[PDB]
Amino acid sequence: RATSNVFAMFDQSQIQEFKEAFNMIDQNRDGFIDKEDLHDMLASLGKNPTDEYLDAMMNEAPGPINFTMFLTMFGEKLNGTDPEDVIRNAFACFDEEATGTIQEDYLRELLTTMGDRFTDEEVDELYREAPIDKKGNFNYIEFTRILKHGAK
Amino acid sequence: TKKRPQRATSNVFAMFDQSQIQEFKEAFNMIDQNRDGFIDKEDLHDMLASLGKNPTDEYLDAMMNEAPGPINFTMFLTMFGEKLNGTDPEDVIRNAFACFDEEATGTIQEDYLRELLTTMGDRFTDEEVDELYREAPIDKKGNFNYIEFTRILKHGAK
Amino acid sequence: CDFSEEQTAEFKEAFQLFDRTGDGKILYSQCGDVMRALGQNPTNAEVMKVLGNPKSDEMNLKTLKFEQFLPMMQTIAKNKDQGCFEDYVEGLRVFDKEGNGTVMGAEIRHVLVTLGEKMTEEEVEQLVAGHEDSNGCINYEELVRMVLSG
Amino acid sequence: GFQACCRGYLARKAFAKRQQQLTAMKVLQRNCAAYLKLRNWQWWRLFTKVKPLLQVSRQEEEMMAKEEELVKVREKQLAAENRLTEMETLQSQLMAEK
Amino acid sequence: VKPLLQVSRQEEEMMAKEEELVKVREKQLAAENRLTEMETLQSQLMAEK
Ligand SMILES: [Mg+2]
Ligand SMILES: [Mg+2]
User: Nearest-CA residue of chain D relative to E32?
Assistant: First the structure.
């Protein structure tokens, strides 16, 4: 957790985007998020679905979610992640030729032979909801966007 | 009960581009005097006093009756999307006019448009065509490509 | 041990970078890689001698620890048969024909592959790489100066 | 004696590539570690749908990029005309010569 | 209100950059075709020489 200033965690652009999102996701803007607003947003986004299981997460945070608590719960889960430019720069280390694609077996071997050894199940879980070419080729240049859930 | 119900619950992306929503948000940012997403009666009153030389009183009452209450970004967007339901993009009509014009350019003539709307086989009356003529630019005939019309209609060549 | 703890900490940290060995151990074949990365310039004969003259099959069926690797590096640093670069820059001049401080890259590759302890084609290429020119020659002086800074 | 320095230079160079590569893999697996639990977060997939609606970039990056790109494209377009004029003279000169 | 908009005014003006860039890009693309055309004519005429 590491309690500290919630504003110093996210970057200027990141905190600005978070504030702009909090100011938008609110049918009755007043610095107080309730289950009704979330249900209405889900109904408007998914073509009127109803998922009553999401209400079982309010107990995690002290009472309703506030903008401060919202930023806190975003930062507590986004810790460790970095922007897309640095991710692409780090990915450019391998391959060398810079083909934009890496073999899936090679990635699995790399993720289980150095640093934090990732189990085979954890590596396989990263492909149960995304496309992939029959000839392998892990399109990293294209997967960087899907990593941020910028689709669907 | 300031919090309004689900009210229909219409989506805000049936067939609208991100640029349209961005423009709508930027426009709402100027009307809302409180700067909190609550277009009250005073906001629109000041907007009209600054732009359209003040309203006629009944304008605010009609706008309030046409809305479920304190209008905001989401409510206004949903209302305008429901009102625009059925309207196709400008590129579709542009390509249609370009492919229909025999001159390989996409022009439209007043005399030819009259026959295309009437004798072609439609339910267009005299006033139906007079309104379109009045809505046209300075010229009552499209002697150029179907671009200036879409521009003056949407206020954005995109 | 006649070795300060300051550099010993860095040596332990560098040795712990391999990891891929089951635990805090090290293979016989991979011993030279870690011995040459930390410092010094031991030869294949010196590596085989300090290792106790391991068998041909012993280089892939046993693993050592750090308590045994530290004295190896200590002896390699204290006892050594290397030499300064003044003798190396003067040795490569035997192949220089015109004597203008340049030598053909093919001749150097052949001398490194055949003469001496022999080297694989994958290493000699990476060694001679970067110093390519129009006449295909590689200045031995610049090569030695770059190898010394490595 | 010289082969030892060449062999050590490769081990040292290869070791340096592994040192920086090892740290690079840390950011990769670290970014993917939190992504697992974050992937199944009901608040993430719902909020990502709103990011396209905000567009924090605004004209701060579009105007600067378009302005800087317009200058490069302007000089490139003008440069093409310069090469075209030079080729026109050579093409016309070769025509008179031929 | 669309004609005014203090903030949207820059958007319409910013679109001129993309429009001018696209317009300038069109001339560059057309110039590339003309440049290659002169190269073929220059090379063809040079071959005849
Ligand atoms: Mg709220
Ligand atoms: Mg308001």
Answer: D80
